[PDB]
């Protein structure tokens, strides 16, 4: 695998979004992994519909939460997912209004990175592109992040409370890290992003719930 990868400079990542009040993190993590795979497939970068997921993945909890693997699974069974244009985000629960003429992409399943295995996650990002991850994002130091390669001993790898996207990896100043896209708005952290300590015993649970869709 390369020493460092950044799918932002490669045109794989769409703008940073804002979930707002709805617990749709998972949706934004899923949609982001889907957009990375669509780009690699058709050469076009499109914004996919997290609302489509929130209203339609009956296996999940809408704005109450859900899993990324369930969302890849719904897109696979359903044979598609709409674009953001065709199914705009509202931020609250509404009935499924999935429209097939607005189908922007399809999924052929998903792969799960070996739990707790960072090297594996690295190879996955390096060979696949953006990867859906789940971390502990409850710590104040994480929420007030602005610069640096985030790290805190209090981070709990079994307290996975927020779904995010692994956009690449590298090194800052001798500190290895993961480029993480957040769904808190371009005004949070470092233009919507945060570099999180890599190889530090799977800090904040970075590799405990990683997965990517097949396209
Ligand atoms: C996000 O917006 C909503 N939370 C969830 O989806 C979690 C799962 C994620 C993989 C981390 C969750 C909570 C409760 C239930 C379920 C669920 C799963 C399957 C089926 C039904 C329900 C999933 C959270 N991000 S946040 O709001 O920004 C946040 C919250 C807390 C701490 C930090 N950040």
Swiss-Prot record:
Ranges annotated as spanning the membrane: none
Entry's EC annotation: 3.4.22.38
GO biological process: bone resorption; collagen catabolic process; extracellular matrix disassembly; mitophagy; negative regulation of cartilage development; proteolysis; proteolysis involved in protein catabolic process; thyroid hormone generation
Main location: other
SS bond list: 22-63, 56-96, 155-204
UniProt keywords, alphabetically: Cell membrane, Disease variant, Disulfide bond, Glycoprotein, Hydrolase, Lysosome, Membrane, Protease, Secreted, Signal, Thiol protease, Zymogen
Catalytic reaction equation(s): Broad proteolytic activity. With small-molecule substrates and inhibitors, the major determinant of specificity is P2, which is preferably Leu, Met > Phe, and not Arg
UniProt GO cellular component terms: apical plasma membrane; endolysosome lumen; external side of plasma membrane; extracellular region; extracellular space; intracellular membrane-bounded organelle; lysosomal lumen; lysosome
Keyword Protease: yes
Superkingdom of origin organism: Eukaryota
Annotated catalytic residues: 25, 162, 182
Disorder cited: Pycnodysostosis: A rare autosomal recessive bone disorder characterized by deformity of the skull, maxilla and phalanges, osteosclerosis, and fragility of bone.
Protein name per its UniProtKB record: Cathepsin K
Gene name of this polypeptide: CTSK
